[PDB]
Structure 1
Amino acid sequence: MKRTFQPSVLKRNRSHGFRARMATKNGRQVLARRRAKGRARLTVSK
């Protein structure tokens, strides 16, 4: 019902977390295809 989009930090630890996107191999290919090979940036680290 309480739909939907919102920002927060503490909810990133099981889903949205940068060190977990490197810890999991499933994230690790994405991370390189998105910046190191993908010519780009993220920088949203806050």
Structure 2
Amino acid sequence: MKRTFQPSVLKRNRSHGFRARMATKNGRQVLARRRAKGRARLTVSK
């Protein structure tokens, strides 16, 4: 059985990484939300 998570570091970074977040206003809103919440890791980049 092929499962849904097929890891790939490049695609992970390009879709959910810090620089992909900072590209868009909504991405910066995500970062602001996660800073307000106090998350230890802001993004998958870490």
Normalising by structure 2, we get a TM-score of: 0.55
Larger helix share, 1 or 2: 2
Per-residue CA shift, 1:4-42, capped at 9, x if unaligned?
A: 123321113552121010111121101111025646433
Percent identity between the two aligned chains: 100
Give the 4+ runs in structure 1 shifted more than 4 A.
none
Consecutive unaligned residues of structure 1, counting only runs of 5 or more, are none
Say what the alpha-carbon RMSD is for the aligned residues: 2.9
Note the C-alpha offset of 1:44: 4.6
Normalising by structure 1, we get a TM-score of: 0.55
Consecutive unaligned residues of structure 2, counting only runs of 5 or more, are none
Q: CA separation of 1:13/1:45 partners in 2, compared to 1, >3 Å: closer, same or farther?
A: closer
